[PDB]
RNA sequence: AUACGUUAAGUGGAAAAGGAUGUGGAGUUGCUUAGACAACCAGGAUGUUGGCUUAGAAGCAGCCACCAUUUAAAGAGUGCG
């Protein structure tokens, strides 16, 4: 099992994929069409993909959401957070806005509940130093 | 919480004599042993169960009491199941083969290596890599295992010569 | 020892209203194997199910002294008790059985628990 | 490195240590402090050797306390000079020390760090010493 | 090494007197020590 | 010689700072048959390396807000890597 961050819009050249999965016995020609299929809904983003390795050289893949807290910069409206969080509260975000963010992360999050999904994001918003309001 | 108070069952068939003072002549199909025992210890034989008891709680007695049980358990098992210690040779041209009772060892020294087992001990060579020293005496099998190890002290830089199976020799980076 | 009482009194409250339960051995209890079961609890309900591996004969068996007096035989060795709150019984007996058959933790050949006055044979 | 701005006399008698300390036996300015078991002379350089050892390990923290300011000079006749023909000169300074006296104090520091800072000072000081804490009956 | 004030260096080290001479032993050979 | 002990090195019959599961007594305290120290079999966190960074270094360049959930349990980290 070797996780990789294959881009959604492209999958063919050796240097990003190539030998690294080619030594796994993976048939690269047969899967590249698949990476361009389901990920087309979210083109232009770098989508991480888990890769299990069956003994029969069969394969099944699971796509994931773009990485967490990157969205927090957008909701804050600021390009970058403080280098001194809490000591420097550069930005603030409403609790209702956090609900919009947590729902996007649900397939990636292992959180049992939407109320718990809130608390998970709350630990990320504090990393940016952003106040929770 | 303590060692010698624990009971030791005899699976059988292992008889145990109680001859003074004090000699324990364990007997059976595989062999016999007579461990030395100073008088202060008290060995007793419950039916198919060896027993040991401490004369006092004094610190000197606390040490000796835990040893006497561990030895008797080593004795009975060697009279039954027996014992063996593997030895994993590692290298390229290294190999070993018997010549009579003697065990020739083609160690990387230009001088040929030979080791003679003591009576009651035999060394089969199922493969050139593995080495097995069968024997009823743990003190002797571990001694012979050390004597064979003496022929080649292991090199930390690379797996060579005698090596316990299994054991991790410390890795080293050459340059 | 006051903390131990919280371990006792709380779990008894579940058993008084408990419906069904199943034996689960603790051997080779991989964390990934647990998550596969925990997600199933999320479908059946929420936090209402309990995994609590407080399976000492001095612990859980005392809870069984009031009700479910069949745990005395199951008490030796590893156990993973489960308790139901609401949820009409069905899949709960079946879901864990499917997991052990595909590797992941010995089932213990299902020693069984309270349902009537019986033991073995999940339905 | 601590020396007096002025002294009434260039030289003084070496004296004779005996008995329990006249005072300062009980630490209170600091949460913890070194306490000598015996009595012996301490040169000014030995005191500086102790404080430098603490400031590094302590990092950020409360100020180091020093209850003891040296005042008694130790005479040092130049080498190979014959006996007599006048008293020598004060090469340096030495504080008087008595058993049970609080040689140093520390405060505002965590319990783990405090155990070490008192220990490193004990090596620089020839006198045997022991861990001590404030008493509050009180 | 041999020093009068043998001390443990890491958690793996263990203090064991042998033949009247205290010796610290560790999985790392460098930490091996004996007093006297 | 008598009685209660202590000492194991020839200490007694040569010093020190310092070091040590040496041993004999005394005291205090944590846990502890609603379970202790040893184990031997179980698992190791979830988003996540998480913010600020250094090409990248995800338990770990190092500076830290070092969060909250899954819960029988685990620090967004004890350590060999």
XYZ file of C-alpha atoms (C1' of nucleotides) in Angstrom:
686
model
C 0.000 0.000 0.000
C 1.639 3.203 -1.247
C -0.242 6.502 -0.952
C 0.472 9.226 -3.529
C -0.807 12.688 -4.459
C -1.503 12.196 -8.169
C -2.982 15.344 -9.775
C -6.622 15.013 -10.855
C -6.151 16.517 -14.312
C -3.084 14.544 -15.381
C -1.718 11.009 -15.035
C 0.858 9.635 -17.488
C 4.495 10.816 -17.209
C 7.018 8.591 -15.416
C 8.537 11.104 -12.961
C 5.405 11.649 -10.875
C 4.138 8.047 -11.037
C 6.249 5.768 -13.238
C 8.579 3.203 -11.585
C 7.383 4.034 -8.054
C 4.151 2.163 -8.767
C 5.641 0.259 -11.692
C 7.757 -1.831 -9.339
C 4.524 -2.768 -7.574
C 3.503 -4.668 -10.699
C 0.791 -2.098 -11.381
C -0.245 -1.781 -15.030
C 0.106 1.979 -15.405
C -1.548 2.146 -18.831
C -4.801 0.646 -17.565
C -5.352 2.904 -14.552
C -4.480 6.358 -15.903
C -7.844 6.509 -17.660
C -9.465 5.830 -14.283
C -7.673 8.685 -12.498
C -9.015 11.094 -15.116
C -12.566 9.774 -14.756
C -13.999 10.283 -11.263
C -11.603 13.141 -10.487
C -12.898 15.164 -13.446
C -15.606 16.541 -11.116
C -12.817 18.316 -9.195
C -10.343 19.212 -11.946
C -7.369 21.479 -11.272
C -6.881 20.184 -7.737
C -4.237 17.804 -6.387
C -6.228 14.814 -5.129
C -4.530 12.229 -2.857
C -5.331 8.572 -3.644
C -4.816 5.454 -1.516
C -3.521 2.420 -3.409
C -4.042 -1.079 -2.005
C -2.000 -3.863 -3.617
C -3.733 -7.202 -4.223
C -1.665 -10.334 -4.907
C -3.596 -10.934 -8.175
C -2.534 -7.491 -9.479
C -6.148 -6.390 -9.191
C -6.520 -2.885 -7.758
C -9.167 -0.661 -6.168
C -8.601 3.017 -5.393
C -10.115 5.565 -2.997
C -9.992 9.299 -3.755
C -9.725 11.929 -1.004
C -10.495 15.608 -0.383
C -7.903 18.406 -0.792
C -5.861 18.933 2.415
C -7.404 20.436 5.547
C -7.076 24.012 6.868
C -6.335 25.320 3.379
C -10.044 26.168 3.323
C -9.659 28.083 6.591
C -7.509 30.681 4.837
C -10.389 31.321 2.443
C -13.089 31.703 5.096
C -10.811 34.062 7.026
C -10.315 36.070 3.843
C -6.613 36.324 4.649
C -3.888 34.685 2.540
C -1.837 33.571 5.553
C -2.256 33.103 9.299
C -0.223 34.459 12.206
C 3.170 32.979 13.037
C 2.162 33.571 16.648
C -1.334 32.050 17.128
C -3.532 33.188 20.055
C -0.812 35.691 20.975
C -1.756 37.370 17.686
C -5.415 36.942 16.718
C -5.143 38.177 13.125
C -8.445 36.671 11.951
C -11.930 35.607 13.070
C -14.523 33.168 11.690
C -18.178 32.545 12.589
C -19.185 29.119 13.912
C -21.761 28.770 11.104
C -19.010 29.198 8.495
C -17.160 26.313 10.132
C -20.195 24.115 9.485
C -19.781 24.702 5.751
C -16.145 23.613 5.996
C -16.644 20.485 8.102
C -19.222 19.076 5.683
C -16.702 19.198 2.833
C -14.202 17.194 4.888
C -16.676 14.463 5.878
C -15.552 11.763 3.411
C -11.948 12.397 4.593
C -12.788 12.810 8.302
C -13.315 9.687 10.398
C -15.503 11.685 12.784
C -18.552 9.840 14.117
C -20.888 12.886 14.155
C -21.383 16.265 12.466
C -21.225 17.798 15.943
C -17.946 15.942 16.410
C -16.880 16.972 12.912
C -17.187 20.537 14.177
C -14.823 19.914 17.081
C -12.244 18.376 14.747
C -12.153 21.496 12.573
C -12.019 23.663 15.709
C -8.593 22.244 16.503
C -7.446 23.276 13.039
C -8.838 26.813 13.177
C -6.875 27.438 16.374
C -3.678 26.493 14.535
C -4.241 29.504 12.290
C -4.836 31.549 15.433
C -8.319 32.345 14.149
C -10.969 33.130 16.773
C -14.060 30.903 16.801
C -17.210 33.040 16.831
C 6.082 -13.176 43.484
C 8.705 -15.799 44.339
C 10.632 -18.549 42.533
C 11.165 -21.713 44.561
C 7.777 -21.948 46.261
C 6.247 -22.939 42.914
C 5.471 -26.625 42.329
C 7.151 -28.690 39.602
C 5.044 -31.447 38.033
C 6.709 -34.563 36.623
C 5.135 -35.433 33.257
C 6.890 -38.780 33.426
C 8.457 -41.128 33.326
C 10.971 -39.407 35.592
C 11.944 -40.976 38.924
C 13.795 -38.853 41.501
C 16.024 -40.370 44.196
C 16.472 -38.634 47.559
C 20.016 -39.679 48.493
C 22.052 -37.677 51.017
C 23.712 -35.396 51.413
C 22.558 -34.043 49.187
C 22.662 -35.715 45.771
C 19.697 -35.846 43.398
C 20.099 -38.635 40.845
C 17.382 -37.847 38.302
C 16.840 -40.755 35.894
C 15.058 -41.528 32.630
C 15.274 -42.632 28.964
C 17.384 -39.662 27.814
C 19.988 -39.645 30.586
C 20.870 -39.036 34.232
C 22.157 -36.136 36.349
C 23.408 -35.560 39.898
C 23.281 -31.882 40.880
C 25.213 -30.881 44.005
C 23.160 -29.612 46.959
C 24.339 -28.146 50.261
C 22.531 -29.498 53.382
C 20.685 -26.230 54.233
C 18.278 -26.771 51.294
C 15.296 -29.095 51.753
C 14.108 -31.072 48.726
C 10.953 -33.199 49.019
C 9.010 -35.394 46.596
C 5.248 -35.009 46.370
C 3.604 -37.550 44.018
C 4.820 -36.577 40.521
C 5.736 -33.184 42.032
C 9.159 -31.945 43.140
C 9.156 -29.380 45.965
C 11.571 -26.895 47.560
C 11.339 -24.960 50.845
C 13.346 -22.146 52.448
C 14.782 -22.688 55.966
C 14.659 -18.920 56.583
C 13.962 -15.483 55.020
C 17.642 -14.436 55.255
C 18.993 -12.744 52.123
C 21.669 -15.366 51.462
C 19.052 -18.120 51.604
C 16.743 -16.081 49.369
C 19.277 -16.287 46.551
C 20.131 -19.988 46.808
C 16.495 -21.072 47.152
C 15.464 -19.697 43.771
C 18.369 -21.393 42.022
C 17.683 -24.924 43.244
C 14.227 -25.051 41.664
C 15.368 -23.651 38.324
C 18.121 -26.264 38.120
C 15.828 -29.198 38.898
C 13.416 -28.013 36.225
C 16.293 -27.854 33.764
C 17.252 -31.373 34.820
C 13.880 -33.047 34.293
C 13.287 -31.442 30.894
C 16.653 -32.683 29.643
C 15.740 -36.172 30.811
C 12.577 -35.790 28.731
C 12.229 -33.229 25.932
C 15.969 -32.566 25.771
C 17.547 -29.339 24.517
C 19.132 -27.766 21.442
C 20.691 -24.450 20.403
C 20.762 -23.206 16.817
C 23.725 -21.398 15.265
C 23.298 -19.397 12.055
C 26.510 -19.207 10.031
C 26.563 -16.228 7.661
C 28.880 -15.523 4.731
C 29.785 -16.778 1.265
C 32.345 -19.585 1.322
C 31.557 -20.615 4.894
C 30.411 -24.219 5.364
C 30.535 -27.116 7.835
C 30.520 -30.922 7.747
C 31.138 -33.741 10.227
C 34.077 -36.143 10.088
C 33.220 -38.902 12.520
C 32.099 -37.628 15.919
C 34.341 -34.595 15.364
C 32.792 -31.468 13.849
C 35.014 -29.957 11.157
C 34.375 -26.255 10.564
C 35.436 -24.570 7.327
C 35.859 -21.194 9.020
C 37.548 -18.428 7.014
C 40.831 -18.937 8.864
C 43.428 -20.681 6.695
C 43.791 -23.170 9.549
C 41.102 -25.886 9.575
C 38.756 -25.812 12.574
C 37.679 -28.874 14.559
C 35.654 -29.263 17.753
C 35.119 -32.504 19.662
C 31.765 -32.871 21.464
C 31.794 -34.351 24.973
C 30.012 -37.657 25.624
C 26.219 -37.503 25.732
C 26.248 -34.753 23.110
C 25.910 -34.960 19.315
C 25.942 -32.345 16.545
C 23.928 -33.020 13.387
C 24.413 -30.766 10.355
C 21.070 -30.606 8.467
C 22.361 -27.636 6.455
C 25.594 -25.725 5.849
C 24.098 -22.604 7.427
C 22.311 -23.898 10.525
C 24.041 -25.773 13.348
C 22.295 -27.799 16.059
C 23.928 -29.022 19.268
C 21.563 -31.545 20.861
C 22.176 -32.445 24.505
C 20.522 -33.283 27.820
C 22.614 -30.723 29.757
C 21.767 -27.018 29.370
C 24.989 -26.026 31.126
C 26.966 -28.132 28.658
C 25.020 -27.330 25.483
C 25.398 -23.637 26.242
C 29.077 -24.191 26.959
C 29.670 -25.969 23.659
C 27.622 -23.229 21.994
C 30.066 -20.741 23.490
C 33.117 -22.771 22.479
C 31.877 -22.897 18.889
C 31.231 -19.155 19.097
C 34.812 -18.700 20.312
C 36.108 -19.810 16.908
C 34.678 -16.645 15.355
C 33.630 -13.560 17.293
C 30.849 -11.794 15.361
C 31.710 -8.674 13.358
C 29.425 -5.670 13.943
C 30.145 -4.370 10.419
C 28.857 -7.520 8.687
C 27.114 -10.767 9.569
C 29.876 -13.377 9.679
C 30.656 -16.543 11.611
C 28.572 -17.793 14.523
C 25.304 -15.969 15.228
C 22.420 -16.868 17.542
C 19.031 -17.499 15.939
C 17.653 -15.106 16.251
C 19.668 -12.094 17.377
C 20.316 -8.633 15.939
C 24.010 -7.779 15.699
C 24.491 -4.002 15.832
C 24.564 -2.331 12.418
C 27.695 -0.407 11.410
C 28.390 1.923 8.486
C 31.732 1.513 6.732
C 33.480 4.089 4.560
C -11.047 2.973 44.656
C -13.901 5.434 44.135
C -13.058 5.513 40.424
C -13.610 1.755 40.242
C -17.177 2.239 41.464
C -17.873 4.428 38.434
C -16.689 1.501 36.325
C -19.245 -0.686 38.094
C -22.387 1.369 38.726
C -22.544 2.883 35.231
C -22.301 -0.367 33.262
C -24.979 -1.970 35.449
C -27.394 0.758 34.355
C -26.994 -0.469 30.785
C -27.445 -4.135 31.709
C -30.726 -3.400 33.503
C -32.104 -2.087 30.206
C -29.929 -4.311 28.006
C -31.493 -6.444 25.269
C -28.767 -8.550 23.621
C -25.011 -9.187 23.760
C -22.189 -11.278 22.261
C -18.844 -12.821 23.301
C -15.705 -11.309 21.737
C -12.165 -12.556 22.440
C -9.484 -9.819 22.903
C -6.641 -11.748 21.173
C -4.987 -10.011 18.208
C -7.291 -7.030 18.663
C -5.988 -4.794 15.883
C -7.103 -1.162 16.011
C -8.150 -1.321 12.363
C -10.313 -4.338 13.199
C -12.009 -2.308 15.925
C -12.787 0.619 13.621
C -14.592 -1.728 11.232
C -16.854 -2.667 14.136
C -17.169 0.896 15.433
C -18.424 2.122 12.057
C -21.127 -0.543 12.217
C -22.195 0.898 15.566
C -22.540 4.270 13.847
C -25.094 2.724 11.497
C -27.017 0.850 14.188
C -26.889 3.865 16.525
C -24.240 6.062 18.157
C -22.441 6.016 21.510
C -25.160 3.739 22.925
C -23.152 0.587 22.182
C -20.310 -0.251 24.570
C -17.005 -2.023 23.925
C -15.657 -1.864 27.521
C -13.040 -4.594 27.977
C -13.311 -4.475 31.767
C -13.524 -8.249 31.812
C -11.878 -9.148 35.124
C -13.727 -11.827 37.090
C -13.495 -9.384 39.990
C -15.093 -6.701 37.794
C -17.778 -7.489 35.212
C -18.849 -10.756 36.852
C -19.963 -8.803 39.931
C -22.204 -6.795 37.613
C -23.605 -10.110 36.398
C -24.556 -11.096 39.947
C -27.775 -9.084 39.615
C -28.757 -10.263 36.116
C -27.423 -12.474 33.330
C -26.089 -15.147 35.704
C -24.591 -17.072 32.763
C -21.313 -15.094 32.601
C -19.581 -17.314 35.191
C -18.624 -19.880 32.545
C -17.506 -17.285 29.994
C -15.378 -15.471 32.563
C -11.986 -17.157 32.092
C -9.569 -15.588 29.569
C -10.042 -12.609 27.245
C -13.500 -11.099 26.682
C -14.951 -7.996 25.008
C -18.414 -7.276 26.405
C -21.033 -5.468 24.343
C -24.303 -3.908 25.497
C -27.416 -2.647 23.722
C -29.630 0.292 24.759
C -32.441 0.522 22.206
C -32.037 -1.036 18.723
C -34.204 -4.058 17.939
C -31.841 -7.056 17.773
C -30.843 -8.459 14.372
C -27.552 -7.534 12.704
C -25.664 -7.116 15.989
C -25.482 -10.881 16.464
C -24.544 -11.255 12.798
C -22.092 -8.393 12.098
C -19.344 -9.469 14.519
C -19.612 -13.069 13.317
C -18.853 -11.973 9.755
C -15.703 -10.179 10.888
C -13.953 -13.059 12.651
C -14.562 -15.412 9.721
C -12.477 -13.076 7.566
C -9.440 -13.221 9.865
C -9.235 -10.413 12.440
C -9.510 -11.703 16.030
C -10.633 -15.167 17.154
C -14.397 -15.390 17.683
C -13.964 -17.846 20.547
C -16.353 -20.029 18.537
C -19.002 -17.757 20.107
C -19.385 -18.798 23.756
C -22.668 -16.891 23.706
C -24.513 -14.628 26.132
C -27.966 -13.671 27.405
C -30.937 -13.991 25.044
C -33.050 -16.565 26.828
C -31.235 -19.005 29.101
C -28.726 -20.310 26.546
C -25.215 -19.877 25.151
C -23.793 -20.976 21.795
C -25.316 -20.304 18.310
C -25.658 -16.753 16.991
C -28.788 -16.063 14.940
C 32.999 37.900 40.258
C 32.229 40.077 43.279
C 34.629 42.379 45.118
C 34.120 45.190 47.676
C 34.193 48.812 46.509
C 36.359 49.599 49.533
C 37.761 47.943 52.667
C 38.914 49.563 55.920
C 42.116 47.498 56.026
C 44.278 45.972 53.289
C 44.862 42.770 55.273
C 43.273 40.795 58.120
C 43.816 37.742 60.332
C 42.773 34.393 58.855
C 40.645 33.651 61.921
C 39.456 30.429 63.553
C 36.190 28.845 62.404
C 34.113 27.009 65.010
C 30.510 26.284 65.965
C 27.117 26.819 64.340
C 26.570 29.765 61.975
C 25.723 33.109 63.582
C 22.741 33.480 61.255
C 21.245 33.024 57.803
C 20.825 29.319 58.524
C 17.219 29.375 57.310
C 16.490 29.951 53.621
C 13.444 32.133 52.898
C 14.175 34.590 50.066
C 14.235 31.640 47.677
C 12.137 28.493 47.332
C 15.241 26.308 47.649
C 18.873 26.697 48.672
C 22.213 24.955 49.150
C 23.290 24.366 52.767
C 26.879 23.529 53.739
C 27.461 20.562 56.050
C 30.904 21.778 57.139
C 33.014 24.941 57.024
C 35.884 25.872 54.705
C 37.312 28.870 52.843
C 35.788 29.802 49.489
C 37.732 31.927 46.995
C 35.842 34.498 44.922
C 36.514 32.529 41.734
C 34.759 29.486 43.204
C 31.592 31.533 43.685
C 31.635 32.738 40.083
C 32.146 29.153 38.921
C 28.875 28.137 40.567
C 26.613 30.915 39.284
C 27.753 30.460 35.674
C 26.893 26.764 35.911
C 23.323 27.574 36.929
C 22.523 30.342 34.439
C 23.082 28.032 31.471
C 20.971 25.108 32.683
C 18.193 27.290 34.132
C 17.686 29.189 30.865
C 14.708 31.502 31.367
C 13.734 31.798 35.031
C 14.002 33.729 38.281
C 17.104 35.629 39.373
C 19.905 33.738 41.115
C 20.272 34.611 44.806
C 23.602 35.179 46.572
C 23.415 35.571 50.351
C 27.189 35.577 50.721
C 29.433 38.520 49.855
C 33.187 37.841 50.331
C 35.062 40.178 52.688
C 38.120 38.439 54.151
C 41.361 38.655 52.107
C 43.730 35.690 51.878
C 47.399 36.636 52.127
C 49.682 35.374 49.351
C 53.446 35.759 49.753
C 55.345 35.683 46.430
C 57.075 32.386 45.614
C 60.561 31.392 46.837
C 60.649 34.383 49.195
C 62.129 33.552 52.604
C 59.997 33.424 55.750
C 59.327 36.697 57.543
C 60.528 40.048 56.188
C 56.965 41.355 56.258
C 53.462 40.097 55.552
C 52.433 39.259 51.983
C 49.702 40.746 49.804
C 46.000 39.928 49.221
C 45.892 38.026 45.921
C 42.116 37.764 46.265
C 39.155 37.507 48.627
C 37.476 34.731 50.632
C 34.081 34.729 52.345
C 33.826 33.308 55.862
C 31.798 30.081 55.904
C 30.058 28.252 58.756
C 28.304 24.863 58.861
C 24.551 24.884 58.234
C 24.724 28.231 56.442
C 22.680 28.806 53.276
C 25.389 29.219 50.629
C 22.953 30.013 47.793
C 19.236 30.327 47.000
C 16.918 29.751 44.026
C 13.227 30.555 43.450
C 10.511 30.491 40.790
C 12.023 27.326 39.347
C 10.352 23.955 38.679
C 11.075 21.101 41.093
C 13.034 19.015 38.581
C 15.333 21.818 37.429
C 15.908 22.873 41.043
C 17.400 19.489 41.954
C 20.122 19.855 39.324
C 21.147 23.481 39.864
C 21.828 22.769 43.534
C 23.807 19.693 42.496
C 26.207 21.343 40.046
C 26.970 23.979 42.678
C 27.840 21.197 45.122
C 30.714 20.026 42.925
C 32.263 23.485 42.563
C 32.114 23.844 46.344
C 34.575 21.624 48.268
C 32.239 21.497 51.284
C 29.646 18.701 51.329
C 26.085 20.005 50.900
C 22.448 18.873 51.017
C 19.073 19.704 49.444
C 16.927 22.151 51.445
C 13.408 23.613 51.180
C 11.441 26.418 52.852
C 9.502 25.646 56.026
C 6.047 27.127 56.645
C 4.538 26.215 60.020
C 3.924 29.125 59.690
C 36.069 2.457 30.142
C 37.268 2.620 33.746
C 36.464 5.575 36.003
C 36.071 5.922 39.808
C 32.621 7.513 39.416
C 30.769 5.187 37.049
C 27.280 6.458 36.197
C 24.391 5.442 33.908
C 24.259 7.400 30.644
C 20.963 6.174 29.189
C 17.864 4.274 30.316
C 19.123 1.046 28.730
C 22.098 1.075 31.116
C 22.007 -1.159 34.195
C 24.168 -1.182 37.329
C 25.557 -4.605 38.251
C 28.403 -5.275 40.680
C 30.766 -8.082 39.645
C 33.675 -9.599 41.586
C 33.563 -6.702 44.046
C 33.720 -4.153 41.232
C 30.587 -2.322 40.077
C 29.954 -2.452 36.320
C 27.359 -0.651 34.198
C 26.204 -2.607 31.148
C 24.179 -1.456 28.128
C 23.050 -2.653 24.696
C 25.360 0.027 23.323
C 29.015 -1.033 23.822
C 30.244 2.528 24.470
C 28.174 2.800 27.655
C 29.851 -0.241 29.220
C 31.825 0.801 32.313
C 33.578 -0.480 35.445
C 34.731 1.250 38.618
C 38.087 0.335 40.145
C 34.597 -15.384 79.963
C 29.084 -14.286 79.706
C 24.788 -11.532 77.128
C 22.663 -8.376 72.991
C 24.278 -7.152 68.124
C 27.129 -5.316 63.804
C 30.724 -6.151 60.214
C 33.372 -9.964 55.182
C 36.760 -6.746 53.234
C 41.855 -8.696 56.183
C 37.766 -3.474 56.870
C 39.974 -3.899 61.874
C 45.645 -2.870 60.609
C 46.173 4.477 55.739
C 43.370 9.886 53.271
C 39.854 12.820 50.300
C 35.919 15.195 46.468
C 32.815 12.019 44.054
C 30.136 7.183 42.662
C 27.124 2.707 43.774
C 19.610 -2.602 44.073
C 26.490 -3.550 49.779
C 24.155 -4.616 54.355
C 21.841 -3.748 59.456
C 17.993 -0.256 61.930
C 14.329 4.151 62.036
C 10.738 7.264 59.704
C 7.572 9.183 55.628
C 4.668 8.155 51.316
C 2.317 6.169 46.245
C -0.249 1.914 44.527
C -2.426 -2.601 46.269
C -7.432 -9.349 46.406
C -13.495 -3.532 43.386
C -6.104 -5.569 42.330
C 0.473 -4.010 42.830
C 5.587 -4.600 40.705
C 7.793 -8.736 37.141
C 6.110 -10.523 32.903
C 3.654 -13.487 28.507
C 0.069 -12.846 25.173
C -3.465 -7.611 22.822
C -3.302 -2.925 20.290
C -1.308 1.511 19.302
C -3.995 6.422 17.965
C -8.383 9.673 14.403
C -8.193 14.520 11.102
C -2.338 15.025 10.859
C 2.494 17.465 10.267
C -0.958 20.414 12.682
C 0.605 26.022 12.639
C 5.330 28.971 11.511
C 10.039 26.816 8.641
C 14.408 24.903 6.222
C 14.548 21.454 -1.314
C 11.337 17.754 0.539
C 12.003 15.857 7.009
C 4.840 13.395 8.217
C 6.611 10.580 16.361
C 11.411 13.871 14.696
C 15.362 21.038 10.654
C 13.575 23.199 15.113
C 9.845 27.153 17.448
C 5.540 26.119 19.202
C -1.379 27.756 19.684
C 1.141 21.179 20.821
C -5.919 21.111 19.674
C -10.005 18.531 20.304
C -12.240 13.167 19.097
C -12.391 7.252 18.606
C -12.787 5.132 22.944
C -10.963 -0.962 26.243
C -6.773 2.805 25.485
C -2.412 6.194 23.240
C 1.427 12.451 23.272
C -0.912 15.659 16.550
C 4.497 12.017 20.319
C 8.586 8.216 24.998
C 12.413 6.388 22.117
C 16.051 3.011 18.186
C 15.034 4.682 13.241
